[PDB]
Design a protein around this ligand. Structure first.
Ligand SMILES: O=C(O)c1ccco1
Length: 518
């Protein structure tokens, strides 16, 4: 039902051309600024020019480390328009994480929000990078020699006259994806990939349209967010609301109620964690206060009671689907008019789904298998990692690392992960990372972290800690340490002190016994 993109294709030019019908409609609006489609176009093309003027060439990478706001799609589309590959990254990571991404991407320039300039600085100082220029959006401190203010940079250059003559299957952008051990993998996406997600899911599954106002709690750096709040709305001419701050129930409700930009969102997107938090909130708005027509969920399985509670309150379902960084967006989903809570719905038309057992063979309905996806938006490889590329991308099929069960009605029910990671509110969290942080406290002897469901059925990490006999470590002291050592998104929901952990003769911790509540 969807025509493939032409083999000569630049995604940025495609989204700009789509919206030349509507120059004066708002494209993006945030707390302090707004861009119409024609202003976005101009700024996008001037940034493309600016990047070429400082010597960044076609196929070279730039790091895009930016809070959600109107400069973000300018950054992203401007690079793409130039045939430069933006590497769009999480804004909550450490200087060490970024130092690795600068070296691994060989980024030649960085586009960074002033609030993130201190962490970027640390990463630049410590690494062997190739960064020729730092372009700072909304600087929060004085610019260092050679750094340039984003607005000045865009404003200094005339718009690039034509886009880079890219192929549809040329790399257009990277995201990073983390595993339970080891450094993040550079997921390489082509120009065609987000065309396929925006058409097969944004348009043909959600039925987004021009008069929509989109608002995603999931940031633009998330694959989920990048669809929800950039590629999908730009595909149909919707207006997008962007928000720089942390998405709490209050910040979201403020927006829902038309507190920014004079717009009320019609389409909202977020993790089940956020929806649970909102429904808990004593000032949840009533349906007559909001203009929501469509509530999308992804980033962990949606507990049935959260959808049911949302539906009872709003008269609107939560439409929960699953995608990945490697598949770019959702491939298995409930539909806006067909929702079965306790399942992730049906394959998205355009994607083929398989469940494979221990030998790669078929599994009987109602038995769990590992999920593999065949669809036209899959990443081509992990950059510079052939072993991991071979394990994940196998002849047109992409291994998700999830397990699922197929139901008699052809829907799919989540069954666990194949690789120890915990999916906590949209972000993959490694139990092994948390264990290695806890053992650096002198009062901890050993530590084990597993996922446990909270009162809402949502998975959070839980730490089992053996304290070191000669020391005094209290629960609070450990919480103080965790607070200093880890990002809030990685916190254990609770920590239990035990006398010993169950292990094999080799010292392998039997984490499955801790999940069983021994
Ligand atoms: O379920 C996810 O985590 C997802 C949705 C779209 C992209 O990633």
């Amino acid at each position: 039902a969807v025509t493939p993109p032409p083999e000569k294709f630049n995604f940025a030019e495609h989204l700009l051309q789509t919206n030349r019908v509507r120059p004066d409609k708002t494209a993006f609006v945030d707390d302090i600024s707004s861009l119409s489609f024609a202003q976005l176009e101009a700024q996008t093309r001037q940034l493309a020019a600016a990047l070429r003027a400082i010597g960044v060439k076609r196929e070279e990478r730039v790091l895009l480390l930016m809070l959600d706001g109107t400069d973000w799609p300018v950054a992203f589309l401007g690079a793409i328009y130039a045939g430069i590959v933006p590497v769009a990254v999480n804004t909550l990571l450490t200087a060490d994480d970024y130092a690795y991404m600068l070296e691994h991407s060989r980024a030649q320039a960085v586009l960074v929000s002033g609030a993130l300039h201190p962490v970027l600085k640390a990463a630049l100082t410590k690494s062997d990078h190739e960064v020729q220029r730092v372009i700072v959006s909304r600087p929060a401190a004085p610019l260092e020699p050679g750094e340039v203010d984003f607005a000045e940079f865009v404003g200094a250059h005339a718009p690039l006259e034509k886009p880079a003559a890219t192929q549809a299957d040329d790399p257009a952008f990277w995201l990073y994806s983390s595993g339970s051990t080891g450094r993040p993998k550079g997921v390489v996406h082509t120009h065609a990939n987000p065309y396929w997600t925006s058409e097969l899911y944004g348009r043909n599954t959600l039925h987004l349209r021009e008069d929509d106002v989109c608002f995603s709690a999931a940031k633009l750096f998330f694959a989920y967010g990048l669809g929800n709040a950039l590629t999908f709305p730009m595909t149909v001419g919707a207006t997008t609301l962007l928000m720089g701050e942390r998405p709490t129930p209050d910040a979201v409700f403020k927006r829902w109620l038309g507190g920014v930009g004079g717009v009320k969102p019609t389409v909202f997107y977020g993790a089940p964690t956020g929806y649970a938090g909102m429904l808990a909130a004593p000032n949840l708005p009533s349906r007559d206060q909001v203009a929501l027509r469509l509530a999308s969920s992804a980033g962990e399985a949606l507990p049935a009671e959260i959808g049911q509670r949302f539906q009872r309150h709003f008269g609107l379902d939560i439409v929960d689907g699953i995608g990945s960084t490697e598949m770019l967006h959702i491939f298995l989903s409930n539909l806006p008019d067909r929702v079965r809570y306790g399942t992730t719905g049906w394959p998205v038309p355009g994607y083929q789904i398989e469940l494979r057992g221990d030998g790669g063979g078929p599994v009987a309905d109602g038995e769990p298998g590992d999920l593999y996806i065949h669809g036209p938006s899959s990443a081509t490889m992990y950059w510079g990692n052939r072993a991991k590329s071979r394990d994940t991308f196998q002849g047109g099929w992409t291994k998700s690392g999830d397990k699922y069960v197929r139901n008699d009605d052809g829907s799919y029910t989540y069954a666990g992960r194949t690789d120890d990671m915990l999916k906590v509110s949209g972000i993959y969290v490694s139990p092994f990372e948390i264990e290695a942080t806890l053992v650096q406290h002198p009062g901890v002897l050993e530590a084990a972290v597993v996922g446990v469901a909270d009162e809402h059925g949502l998975t959070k990490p839980k730490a089992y800690v053996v304290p070191r006999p000669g020391q005094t470590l209290s629960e609070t002291e450990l919480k103080t340490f965790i607070k200093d050592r880890l990002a809030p998104y990685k916190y254990p929901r609770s920590t239990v002190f035990v006398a010993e952990l169950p292990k094999t003769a080799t010292g392998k911790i039997q984490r499955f016994k801790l999940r069983e509540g021994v």
